[PDB]
């Protein structure tokens, strides 16, 4: 419960206090109602059964208060469970766009996927499904044992002793099954990742003949997941045997003390018979704890994953904002350094862009051109050195102001699963249709609307799967142009377009009426046409820069890069 | 369900045995309370001590026997279910290996995961728990109620009130939540896809709209709204069932009916012992199947979904039944009905001849490679490799005969040696290293910290040009009689592009090649240039022949220079 209390909203801790008080009142009423059978039946079995009425009235009040208290405990458990669901899920949704890009290792992406995948009714019903019966079962025999002290002192301690072995069984059963339950989760999460990779990479796997379960990696993960789940079923046998022994040990102790007292005359026979029924109520929580103990292990893993997402290191930010909106800003690097893990990408970049001009970044593949665009756009951040937009640090800039400053065309166009217009409109959802058509027309997406049957309502697949490579490239380019931001970064807008679509799109990157400081990335001389200055980057630093004809005349690495 | 009983036919004998065993186990679990009723009755009657000990010890021992039996029965049944799921998931992974590839594009990876993993897991209650809980919830209430009806009908008929209230609540809960249960897997499918798109399209989210305007957040709010509407009245009925069926509730109603009967002369207190002992044990049995109907409803739907995929068409290897000669003949193809992407493509590819496929974007030049791979079956015409039809060839023979590079460098989570040796996982490191050296990626691999063992999952990815060259190394190591290249070296710089093309030509000098490229300057070496426009072959010839003809190829060549 300690982990679950971390995720509770601070605004909702009054409900938790109200919940914990009602849960205790649930147990105390249940135990009192059970132990109220000892004087009730003793009076009922006596020569004057009318004395049973007083204890029946106390039983009725204790039970009716139980129904009211248990309904309220359910209502608070539902509200707390769904309050934790909504706040934790929303906090993950708010945090994850600000989480560092380095956080998304393939293990963390699995954890984030499983954490988001916990949104179903299982996590939302956590407090009602697991926590309420677990606290009820854990404290019910303890409460009955305390309530038995009012009838007979040693009889109560015998019941309390039975609780001690139960909690010992609960502690031991969890320990025995812990290691196998952890391994089962690892293989079940790995198998999840392989199915998603299996479906997402069918063409390559089929061509490689690595698609059959006897030869596939998803098949191996299934085989591992089967053995991990079988050993878990074996390693929970000790836990089930231990709870059975605990129930029998407590049964022997309870029954042994009842007969021991009844032999002496210290306990009437009707009280002894009433204690057989209370003994049945005593032993019911012993079985319920055994049924819920495995669930407690899995839920601990679930919340640990959710807490892992909420513990992810977020990007640095600030509160600065640029002076005016949609003013073409200057962009400069000041000894910017960056590395993926230990692999250094950029090792001393320093340049300046004029406000409103268009400069073309060029260089070999793997040089770090997209990384330069990432730092300009703010997706990454330097380890040391700083990037300034209009003489204002991006790292100390507001998240929204930095977000509004840049619109980019990515190297690999990723489209969300939806209509073609839905992907374009992501650039500016509140843009009027007139500017939408302008962005579509400039990107030559209007040549896709006539050709495709459904026009802009065409349902794109996962990514841009239902569209060709060039089609998704143009839809991505329309998305970037639609956004009214005054900085436009272009990354491989040519890679999937034919010669006719290439030329129109490249020329349309200038026909954009708005004033912007544009950055173009390509490995093709024709695509860097109209560029005011070329930035040649190689081995993680700007090696050469100038004009297209200037460097070609100079015969530098820029010239050699086109001469092959 | 026809699609459920057909899927669960293999587990016939284990399921009937489970119902038979649970009928005996639950009867064994009610035997101690019958003996404890006799023990209590003898205590009031003053029987001898030895008789009491035999009854008391038998009841206590039978409690241990019932607990051991029930634990053993569920252990065997939970091992049966774990084995069936492994077999069933293996069956699904075999089916998905054979479905037409348009099945995956219209469905996505989130839906596949919900099928293989979550739907098979959704069967767990239906197999492992439905028949035990159903039999337990029929035998024990019927056995107890009939036994108690013999003991005293007045207090026995009063036990029917919480029974009927539980029966009404479960039916109302079942009818109400039936529609929501049907919508649940589709909502989970949508949120699985949106969550996967949220995690996969993070660069787009961070720049275009942020967290607030994201489609994931809107769906996340909508899904939780759906869950609240589904789970609020469901959990409300669920807890009312628990309150009704609790042993404390049963004991209270028994005493409400019993105490006025005992205080009055209408009945002796000794006859309360069957009700106080046996009358409060069948509540948990009823609640077991009451909470279980949602598990059956989800299981039956998941069984229907699983069997439906297993009934899908399969790209059947037909029985109808020059090396490296691929021959398209009057081929037509449609991803969706009524939407032609290929229109009567006749093209023959011979060994030692490089055939270049060019044209405007969206003209269908990747569907041809897909059809040659048999990711999809040609709607009309045929594709013959060495005369034999691809539909008659088996998958192993087909993909041994022809290899592919696919314009989308799909890497798999694992070592880069495992990515390069995807075709032949048994291939050695020297074979892997030589393949990478020809693909101009081996130098990049050496700089990684783990070398060739470096895991290549999400986050640890490579640049666009680097991951493309990895997939070229994969096709180099396959070494198939036919090679196909879908926009290979699209992201490569000119020097690396020239080196990769030189290596490819050197390897496939005497091997059939189908190269697709938008940069026509790299295609000047082609033995034949094939121009595809709107899915129809508009002109075929050499570079100079097409330039002289002055058609679509000449237009593209002129517009290339800008
Ligand atoms: N996620 C990553 N993890 C580790 N290294 C990476 C990652 N992404 C890129 N790199 C490496 O960083 C360097 C630059 O990558 P980047 O994607 O910025 O290059 P680029 O200039 O855009 O290349 P290209 O023209 O091939 O697209 C290369 O060594 C690349 O391998
Ligand atoms: N997976 C798919 N599902 C449905 N339709 C598709 C799919 N892939 C492509 N299409 C449609 O097929 C046509 C283009 O097919 P294809 O992918 O072969 O284009 P292409 O000529 O190779 O493209 P490019 O040169 O831009 O890479 C367009 O109508 C596109 O919508
Ligand atoms: Mg790049
Ligand atoms: Mg293509
Ligand atoms: Zn189970």
PDB file of C-alpha atoms in Angstrom, chain A residues 30 37 40-41 44-45 49 53 56 59-60 63 67 70-71 74 78 82 85 89-90 93-94 96-97 99 101 104-106 112-113 116 119-121 128-129 188 191-192 194-213 215 217-218 222 225-226 230 233 237 248 251 273 276-277 280-281 284 343 364-366 377 379 403 406-408 410-412 414 416-418 422 426-427 451 453 462 465 468-469 471-472 474 479-480 483 494-500 502-503 523-524 526 560-561 564, chain B residues 33 36 40 44 60 63-64 75 78-79 82-83 86 89-90 93-94 96-99 101 104-105 108-109 112-113 116-117 195-211 215-217 220-221 223-224 227-228 230-232 235 238-239 243 246-247 249 251-252 255 259-260 262-263 269 272-273 276-277 280 315 339 359-362 375 396 399-400 406-408 410-413 418 421-425 444 458-460 463-467 469 474 490-491 493-495 498 518-519 556 559-560:
ATOM      1  CA  UNK A  30     -17.499  -7.760  10.993  1.00  0.00           C
ATOM      2  CA  UNK A  37     -22.815 -15.140  18.232  1.00  0.00           C
ATOM      3  CA  UNK A  40     -26.343 -14.699  21.468  1.00  0.00           C
ATOM      4  CA  UNK A  41     -26.360 -18.494  21.220  1.00  0.00           C
ATOM      5  CA  UNK A  44     -30.500 -18.741  23.046  1.00  0.00           C
ATOM      6  CA  UNK A  45     -29.427 -22.173  24.334  1.00  0.00           C
ATOM      7  CA  UNK A  49     -34.060 -17.653  25.399  1.00  0.00           C
ATOM      8  CA  UNK A  53     -33.131 -10.485  21.707  1.00  0.00           C
ATOM      9  CA  UNK A  56     -29.840 -10.009  18.044  1.00  0.00           C
ATOM     10  CA  UNK A  59     -26.091  -7.989  15.634  1.00  0.00           C
ATOM     11  CA  UNK A  60     -28.633  -6.215  13.421  1.00  0.00           C
ATOM     12  CA  UNK A  63     -24.583  -5.684  10.296  1.00  0.00           C
ATOM     13  CA  UNK A  67     -23.587  -2.602   4.806  1.00  0.00           C
ATOM     14  CA  UNK A  70     -18.973  -1.330   3.102  1.00  0.00           C
ATOM     15  CA  UNK A  71     -20.972   0.497   0.421  1.00  0.00           C
ATOM     16  CA  UNK A  74     -16.655   0.616  -2.141  1.00  0.00           C
ATOM     17  CA  UNK A  78     -13.868   3.204  -6.810  1.00  0.00           C
ATOM     18  CA  UNK A  82     -10.250   5.967 -10.770  1.00  0.00           C
ATOM     19  CA  UNK A  85      -6.053   6.118 -12.743  1.00  0.00           C
ATOM     20  CA  UNK A  89      -2.378   8.361 -16.701  1.00  0.00           C
ATOM     21  CA  UNK A  90      -2.748  12.088 -17.394  1.00  0.00           C
ATOM     22  CA  UNK A  93       0.708  11.898 -20.835  1.00  0.00           C
ATOM     23  CA  UNK A  94       1.844  15.351 -19.693  1.00  0.00           C
ATOM     24  CA  UNK A  96       6.264  11.939 -21.443  1.00  0.00           C
ATOM     25  CA  UNK A  97       6.556  14.694 -24.107  1.00  0.00           C
ATOM     26  CA  UNK A  99      10.790  13.253 -20.757  1.00  0.00           C
ATOM     27  CA  UNK A 101      14.690  11.382 -25.469  1.00  0.00           C
ATOM     28  CA  UNK A 104      13.289   5.821 -24.389  1.00  0.00           C
ATOM     29  CA  UNK A 105      15.521   2.780 -24.366  1.00  0.00           C
ATOM     30  CA  UNK A 106      13.712  -0.300 -25.731  1.00  0.00           C
ATOM     31  CA  UNK A 112       6.013   3.040 -20.828  1.00  0.00           C
ATOM     32  CA  UNK A 113       3.842   0.917 -23.123  1.00  0.00           C
ATOM     33  CA  UNK A 116      -0.023   3.152 -20.524  1.00  0.00           C
ATOM     34  CA  UNK A 119      -5.290   2.113 -18.253  1.00  0.00           C
ATOM     35  CA  UNK A 120      -7.867  -0.699 -18.438  1.00  0.00           C
ATOM     36  CA  UNK A 121     -10.345  -1.638 -15.705  1.00  0.00           C
ATOM     37  CA  UNK A 128     -12.003  -2.385  -4.880  1.00  0.00           C
ATOM     38  CA  UNK A 129     -10.697  -5.639  -6.362  1.00  0.00           C
ATOM     39  CA  UNK A 188       5.638 -11.662 -20.708  1.00  0.00           C
ATOM     40  CA  UNK A 191       6.957 -11.387 -25.613  1.00  0.00           C
ATOM     41  CA  UNK A 192       4.741  -8.301 -25.954  1.00  0.00           C
ATOM     42  CA  UNK A 194       8.259  -9.179 -30.043  1.00  0.00           C
ATOM     43  CA  UNK A 195       4.638  -9.435 -31.194  1.00  0.00           C
ATOM     44  CA  UNK A 196       4.618  -5.695 -31.890  1.00  0.00           C
ATOM     45  CA  UNK A 197       7.896  -6.094 -33.778  1.00  0.00           C
ATOM     46  CA  UNK A 198       6.606  -9.236 -35.497  1.00  0.00           C
ATOM     47  CA  UNK A 199       3.562  -7.422 -36.895  1.00  0.00           C
ATOM     48  CA  UNK A 200       5.457  -4.186 -37.599  1.00  0.00           C
ATOM     49  CA  UNK A 201       8.313  -5.927 -39.495  1.00  0.00           C
ATOM     50  CA  UNK A 202       6.489  -8.645 -41.433  1.00  0.00           C
ATOM     51  CA  UNK A 203       7.991  -7.917 -44.859  1.00  0.00           C
ATOM     52  CA  UNK A 204      11.609  -8.135 -43.706  1.00  0.00           C
ATOM     53  CA  UNK A 205      10.938 -11.192 -41.542  1.00  0.00           C
ATOM     54  CA  UNK A 206       9.064 -12.990 -44.327  1.00  0.00           C
ATOM     55  CA  UNK A 207      11.840 -12.331 -46.846  1.00  0.00           C
ATOM     56  CA  UNK A 208      14.434 -13.621 -44.366  1.00  0.00           C
ATOM     57  CA  UNK A 209      12.344 -16.760 -43.634  1.00  0.00           C
ATOM     58  CA  UNK A 210      12.457 -15.724 -39.955  1.00  0.00           C
ATOM     59  CA  UNK A 211       8.667 -15.694 -39.569  1.00  0.00           C
ATOM     60  CA  UNK A 212       7.758 -19.260 -38.607  1.00  0.00           C
ATOM     61  CA  UNK A 213       7.426 -19.840 -34.827  1.00  0.00           C
ATOM     62  CA  UNK A 215      12.499 -20.015 -36.480  1.00  0.00           C
ATOM     63  CA  UNK A 217      12.231 -14.497 -32.368  1.00  0.00           C
ATOM     64  CA  UNK A 218       8.581 -14.112 -31.353  1.00  0.00           C
ATOM     65  CA  UNK A 222       6.751 -17.424 -26.589  1.00  0.00           C
ATOM     66  CA  UNK A 225       7.239 -17.006 -21.719  1.00  0.00           C
ATOM     67  CA  UNK A 226       5.778 -20.510 -21.431  1.00  0.00           C
ATOM     68  CA  UNK A 230       5.144 -22.852 -15.795  1.00  0.00           C
ATOM     69  CA  UNK A 233       2.832 -22.207 -11.239  1.00  0.00           C
ATOM     70  CA  UNK A 237       2.818 -24.523  -4.723  1.00  0.00           C
ATOM     71  CA  UNK A 248      -4.825 -26.002   9.898  1.00  0.00           C
ATOM     72  CA  UNK A 251      -7.682 -24.457  13.425  1.00  0.00           C
ATOM     73  CA  UNK A 273     -20.718 -24.660  19.830  1.00  0.00           C
ATOM     74  CA  UNK A 276     -17.293 -23.538  15.924  1.00  0.00           C
ATOM     75  CA  UNK A 277     -19.212 -21.034  13.795  1.00  0.00           C
ATOM     76  CA  UNK A 280     -15.437 -20.955  10.500  1.00  0.00           C
ATOM     77  CA  UNK A 281     -15.574 -17.159  10.195  1.00  0.00           C
ATOM     78  CA  UNK A 284     -12.314 -17.799   5.894  1.00  0.00           C
ATOM     79  CA  UNK A 343      28.819   8.180 -28.824  1.00  0.00           C
ATOM     80  CA  UNK A 364      27.713  12.693 -45.543  1.00  0.00           C
ATOM     81  CA  UNK A 365      25.251  10.260 -44.011  1.00  0.00           C
ATOM     82  CA  UNK A 366      25.634   9.873 -40.265  1.00  0.00           C
ATOM     83  CA  UNK A 377      13.894  22.366 -32.677  1.00  0.00           C
ATOM     84  CA  UNK A 379      13.967  17.782 -29.173  1.00  0.00           C
ATOM     85  CA  UNK A 403       7.249  24.611 -29.214  1.00  0.00           C
ATOM     86  CA  UNK A 406       9.825  25.690 -34.799  1.00  0.00           C
ATOM     87  CA  UNK A 407       8.060  23.475 -37.340  1.00  0.00           C
ATOM     88  CA  UNK A 408      10.103  20.684 -38.919  1.00  0.00           C
ATOM     89  CA  UNK A 410      11.437  14.926 -40.376  1.00  0.00           C
ATOM     90  CA  UNK A 411      13.794  12.602 -42.226  1.00  0.00           C
ATOM     91  CA  UNK A 412      11.518   9.562 -41.875  1.00  0.00           C
ATOM     92  CA  UNK A 414       5.829   9.384 -39.465  1.00  0.00           C
ATOM     93  CA  UNK A 416      -0.390   9.082 -37.131  1.00  0.00           C
ATOM     94  CA  UNK A 417      -3.063   6.498 -37.873  1.00  0.00           C
ATOM     95  CA  UNK A 418      -5.858   8.597 -39.331  1.00  0.00           C
ATOM     96  CA  UNK A 422      -5.859  14.840 -39.802  1.00  0.00           C
ATOM     97  CA  UNK A 426      -1.654  18.578 -36.779  1.00  0.00           C
ATOM     98  CA  UNK A 427       0.599  21.411 -37.959  1.00  0.00           C
ATOM     99  CA  UNK A 451      -5.168  10.487 -57.731  1.00  0.00           C
ATOM    100  CA  UNK A 453      -9.954   7.766 -54.387  1.00  0.00           C
ATOM    101  CA  UNK A 462       0.207   2.858 -38.911  1.00  0.00           C
ATOM    102  CA  UNK A 465       2.123   2.401 -44.234  1.00  0.00           C
ATOM    103  CA  UNK A 468       3.746   5.206 -50.558  1.00  0.00           C
ATOM    104  CA  UNK A 469       7.050   6.635 -49.392  1.00  0.00           C
ATOM    105  CA  UNK A 471       3.038  10.249 -50.481  1.00  0.00           C
ATOM    106  CA  UNK A 472       3.781  10.348 -46.752  1.00  0.00           C
ATOM    107  CA  UNK A 474       4.495  15.215 -49.033  1.00  0.00           C
ATOM    108  CA  UNK A 479       2.091  19.564 -41.997  1.00  0.00           C
ATOM    109  CA  UNK A 480       5.272  21.587 -41.460  1.00  0.00           C
ATOM    110  CA  UNK A 483       2.162  25.568 -38.837  1.00  0.00           C
ATOM    111  CA  UNK A 494      13.424  14.732 -51.500  1.00  0.00           C
ATOM    112  CA  UNK A 495      14.245  11.164 -50.488  1.00  0.00           C
ATOM    113  CA  UNK A 496      10.980   9.573 -51.706  1.00  0.00           C
ATOM    114  CA  UNK A 497       9.769  12.048 -54.373  1.00  0.00           C
ATOM    115  CA  UNK A 498      10.269  11.791 -58.117  1.00  0.00           C
ATOM    116  CA  UNK A 499      12.032  14.463 -60.149  1.00  0.00           C
ATOM    117  CA  UNK A 500       8.847  16.394 -60.941  1.00  0.00           C
ATOM    118  CA  UNK A 502      11.089  17.135 -56.071  1.00  0.00           C
ATOM    119  CA  UNK A 503      11.462  20.344 -58.082  1.00  0.00           C
ATOM    120  CA  UNK A 523      22.617  15.209 -49.926  1.00  0.00           C
ATOM    121  CA  UNK A 524      21.505  16.476 -53.363  1.00  0.00           C
ATOM    122  CA  UNK A 526      19.485  20.392 -56.909  1.00  0.00           C
ATOM    123  CA  UNK A 560      34.597  16.756 -53.459  1.00  0.00           C
ATOM    124  CA  UNK A 561      31.269  15.742 -51.913  1.00  0.00           C
ATOM    125  CA  UNK A 564      32.337  11.463 -55.473  1.00  0.00           C
TER     126      UNK A 564
ATOM    127  CA  UNK B  33     -19.480 -29.229   8.353  1.00  0.00           C
ATOM    128  CA  UNK B  36     -19.266 -30.789  12.871  1.00  0.00           C
ATOM    129  CA  UNK B  40     -22.280 -30.250  18.071  1.00  0.00           C
ATOM    130  CA  UNK B  44     -25.645 -31.209  23.584  1.00  0.00           C
ATOM    131  CA  UNK B  60     -10.621 -31.553  10.849  1.00  0.00           C
ATOM    132  CA  UNK B  63     -10.756 -29.983   5.893  1.00  0.00           C
ATOM    133  CA  UNK B  64      -7.117 -30.716   5.113  1.00  0.00           C
ATOM    134  CA  UNK B  75      -2.658 -26.704 -10.117  1.00  0.00           C
ATOM    135  CA  UNK B  78      -3.666 -24.140 -14.425  1.00  0.00           C
ATOM    136  CA  UNK B  79      -0.935 -26.224 -16.077  1.00  0.00           C
ATOM    137  CA  UNK B  82      -0.800 -22.695 -19.679  1.00  0.00           C
ATOM    138  CA  UNK B  83      -0.035 -25.470 -22.169  1.00  0.00           C
ATOM    139  CA  UNK B  86       1.311 -21.886 -25.575  1.00  0.00           C
ATOM    140  CA  UNK B  89      -0.229 -18.741 -29.438  1.00  0.00           C
ATOM    141  CA  UNK B  90       2.044 -20.960 -31.509  1.00  0.00           C
ATOM    142  CA  UNK B  93       2.117 -17.141 -34.932  1.00  0.00           C
ATOM    143  CA  UNK B  94       2.021 -19.846 -37.612  1.00  0.00           C
ATOM    144  CA  UNK B  96       0.204 -14.806 -39.210  1.00  0.00           C
ATOM    145  CA  UNK B  97       3.297 -16.128 -41.005  1.00  0.00           C
ATOM    146  CA  UNK B  98       1.016 -17.035 -43.950  1.00  0.00           C
ATOM    147  CA  UNK B  99      -1.708 -14.375 -44.117  1.00  0.00           C
ATOM    148  CA  UNK B 101       0.464  -8.851 -45.966  1.00  0.00           C
ATOM    149  CA  UNK B 104      -1.249  -6.392 -41.273  1.00  0.00           C
ATOM    150  CA  UNK B 105      -1.432  -2.949 -42.906  1.00  0.00           C
ATOM    151  CA  UNK B 108      -1.539  -2.506 -37.253  1.00  0.00           C
ATOM    152  CA  UNK B 109       0.794  -3.949 -34.650  1.00  0.00           C
ATOM    153  CA  UNK B 112      -1.885  -8.145 -33.519  1.00  0.00           C
ATOM    154  CA  UNK B 113      -0.571  -7.934 -29.949  1.00  0.00           C
ATOM    155  CA  UNK B 116      -1.761 -13.092 -29.868  1.00  0.00           C
ATOM    156  CA  UNK B 117      -1.266 -12.105 -26.221  1.00  0.00           C
ATOM    157  CA  UNK B 195      -0.261   4.708 -27.083  1.00  0.00           C
ATOM    158  CA  UNK B 196       2.117   3.043 -29.529  1.00  0.00           C
ATOM    159  CA  UNK B 197       1.800   6.010 -31.879  1.00  0.00           C
ATOM    160  CA  UNK B 198       2.307   8.365 -28.932  1.00  0.00           C
ATOM    161  CA  UNK B 199       5.514   6.524 -28.020  1.00  0.00           C
ATOM    162  CA  UNK B 200       6.643   5.997 -31.627  1.00  0.00           C
ATOM    163  CA  UNK B 201       5.740   9.463 -32.937  1.00  0.00           C
ATOM    164  CA  UNK B 202       7.277  11.368 -30.043  1.00  0.00           C
ATOM    165  CA  UNK B 203       9.302  13.779 -32.264  1.00  0.00           C
ATOM    166  CA  UNK B 204       6.100  14.866 -34.017  1.00  0.00           C
ATOM    167  CA  UNK B 205       4.195  15.294 -30.737  1.00  0.00           C
ATOM    168  CA  UNK B 206       6.950  17.371 -29.135  1.00  0.00           C
ATOM    169  CA  UNK B 207       6.868  19.910 -31.990  1.00  0.00           C
ATOM    170  CA  UNK B 208       3.332  19.713 -33.443  1.00  0.00           C
ATOM    171  CA  UNK B 209       0.790  20.230 -30.672  1.00  0.00           C
ATOM    172  CA  UNK B 210       2.677  19.026 -27.616  1.00  0.00           C
ATOM    173  CA  UNK B 211       0.905  17.023 -24.939  1.00  0.00           C
ATOM    174  CA  UNK B 215      -4.604  12.745 -30.192  1.00  0.00           C
ATOM    175  CA  UNK B 216      -3.387  10.399 -27.449  1.00  0.00           C
ATOM    176  CA  UNK B 217      -4.574  12.720 -24.672  1.00  0.00           C
ATOM    177  CA  UNK B 220      -6.933   8.847 -23.081  1.00  0.00           C
ATOM    178  CA  UNK B 221      -9.646  11.112 -21.679  1.00  0.00           C
ATOM    179  CA  UNK B 223     -11.172   5.893 -22.763  1.00  0.00           C
ATOM    180  CA  UNK B 224     -11.264   6.751 -19.061  1.00  0.00           C
ATOM    181  CA  UNK B 227     -14.188   2.997 -18.315  1.00  0.00           C
ATOM    182  CA  UNK B 228     -15.997   5.097 -15.696  1.00  0.00           C
ATOM    183  CA  UNK B 230     -18.503   0.801 -17.713  1.00  0.00           C
ATOM    184  CA  UNK B 231     -16.980   0.250 -14.269  1.00  0.00           C
ATOM    185  CA  UNK B 232     -19.150   2.526 -12.101  1.00  0.00           C
ATOM    186  CA  UNK B 235     -18.614  -2.281  -9.488  1.00  0.00           C
ATOM    187  CA  UNK B 238     -20.421  -6.211  -7.921  1.00  0.00           C
ATOM    188  CA  UNK B 239     -20.236  -5.022  -4.308  1.00  0.00           C
ATOM    189  CA  UNK B 243     -22.859  -7.810   0.554  1.00  0.00           C
ATOM    190  CA  UNK B 246     -21.476 -12.660   2.643  1.00  0.00           C
ATOM    191  CA  UNK B 247     -21.457 -15.286   5.435  1.00  0.00           C
ATOM    192  CA  UNK B 249     -25.233 -11.562   5.878  1.00  0.00           C
ATOM    193  CA  UNK B 251     -25.774 -15.689   9.430  1.00  0.00           C
ATOM    194  CA  UNK B 252     -27.764 -12.550  10.239  1.00  0.00           C
ATOM    195  CA  UNK B 255     -30.789 -15.664  13.158  1.00  0.00           C
ATOM    196  CA  UNK B 259     -34.299 -16.478  16.980  1.00  0.00           C
ATOM    197  CA  UNK B 260     -38.059 -15.686  16.886  1.00  0.00           C
ATOM    198  CA  UNK B 262     -36.421 -20.465  19.090  1.00  0.00           C
ATOM    199  CA  UNK B 263     -37.589 -17.837  21.588  1.00  0.00           C
ATOM    200  CA  UNK B 269     -32.181 -24.404  19.241  1.00  0.00           C
ATOM    201  CA  UNK B 272     -30.072 -24.185  14.133  1.00  0.00           C
ATOM    202  CA  UNK B 273     -26.751 -26.041  14.000  1.00  0.00           C
ATOM    203  CA  UNK B 276     -25.367 -21.854  11.371  1.00  0.00           C
ATOM    204  CA  UNK B 277     -22.636 -24.226  10.104  1.00  0.00           C
ATOM    205  CA  UNK B 280     -23.110 -19.875   5.669  1.00  0.00           C
ATOM    206  CA  UNK B 315      -1.769 -17.481 -49.439  1.00  0.00           C
ATOM    207  CA  UNK B 339      -8.705   0.714 -56.669  1.00  0.00           C
ATOM    208  CA  UNK B 359       8.250   6.611 -62.667  1.00  0.00           C
ATOM    209  CA  UNK B 360       6.268   9.236 -60.770  1.00  0.00           C
ATOM    210  CA  UNK B 361       5.758   8.789 -57.045  1.00  0.00           C
ATOM    211  CA  UNK B 362       2.718   6.684 -56.217  1.00  0.00           C
ATOM    212  CA  UNK B 375       3.439 -10.379 -49.737  1.00  0.00           C
ATOM    213  CA  UNK B 396      11.212 -21.386 -48.238  1.00  0.00           C
ATOM    214  CA  UNK B 399      12.595 -16.609 -50.519  1.00  0.00           C
ATOM    215  CA  UNK B 400      15.636 -18.774 -51.211  1.00  0.00           C
ATOM    216  CA  UNK B 406      12.059  -2.755 -49.261  1.00  0.00           C
ATOM    217  CA  UNK B 407      12.508   1.084 -49.028  1.00  0.00           C
ATOM    218  CA  UNK B 408      11.751   0.985 -45.256  1.00  0.00           C
ATOM    219  CA  UNK B 410      12.788  -2.285 -40.722  1.00  0.00           C
ATOM    220  CA  UNK B 411      15.286  -3.465 -38.105  1.00  0.00           C
ATOM    221  CA  UNK B 412      14.470  -5.943 -35.337  1.00  0.00           C
ATOM    222  CA  UNK B 413      15.331  -5.606 -31.657  1.00  0.00           C
ATOM    223  CA  UNK B 418      21.466 -10.807 -35.732  1.00  0.00           C
ATOM    224  CA  UNK B 421      22.075 -12.453 -40.377  1.00  0.00           C
ATOM    225  CA  UNK B 422      18.286 -12.382 -40.358  1.00  0.00           C
ATOM    226  CA  UNK B 423      18.111 -14.666 -43.402  1.00  0.00           C
ATOM    227  CA  UNK B 424      20.533 -17.297 -42.028  1.00  0.00           C
ATOM    228  CA  UNK B 425      20.667 -17.065 -38.205  1.00  0.00           C
ATOM    229  CA  UNK B 444      30.058   2.086 -38.626  1.00  0.00           C
ATOM    230  CA  UNK B 458      14.164   1.568 -30.279  1.00  0.00           C
ATOM    231  CA  UNK B 459      16.179   4.475 -28.876  1.00  0.00           C
ATOM    232  CA  UNK B 460      19.480   2.818 -29.815  1.00  0.00           C
ATOM    233  CA  UNK B 463      20.800   7.380 -38.804  1.00  0.00           C
ATOM    234  CA  UNK B 464      18.515   7.017 -41.799  1.00  0.00           C
ATOM    235  CA  UNK B 465      21.296   6.197 -44.234  1.00  0.00           C
ATOM    236  CA  UNK B 466      22.956   3.800 -41.798  1.00  0.00           C
ATOM    237  CA  UNK B 467      19.886   1.655 -41.131  1.00  0.00           C
ATOM    238  CA  UNK B 469      22.728   0.085 -45.482  1.00  0.00           C
ATOM    239  CA  UNK B 474      21.048  -8.397 -44.983  1.00  0.00           C
ATOM    240  CA  UNK B 490      17.878   6.647 -51.022  1.00  0.00           C
ATOM    241  CA  UNK B 491      19.328   8.351 -47.927  1.00  0.00           C
ATOM    242  CA  UNK B 493      25.385  10.362 -49.714  1.00  0.00           C
ATOM    243  CA  UNK B 494      26.809  10.196 -53.273  1.00  0.00           C
ATOM    244  CA  UNK B 495      30.106   8.510 -52.314  1.00  0.00           C
ATOM    245  CA  UNK B 498      28.383   4.806 -55.552  1.00  0.00           C
ATOM    246  CA  UNK B 518      13.895   7.952 -58.183  1.00  0.00           C
ATOM    247  CA  UNK B 519      17.357   9.350 -58.916  1.00  0.00           C
ATOM    248  CA  UNK B 556      11.358  13.372 -65.490  1.00  0.00           C
ATOM    249  CA  UNK B 559      12.599  18.231 -64.424  1.00  0.00           C
ATOM    250  CA  UNK B 560      15.380  16.577 -62.413  1.00  0.00           C
TER     251      UNK B 560
END
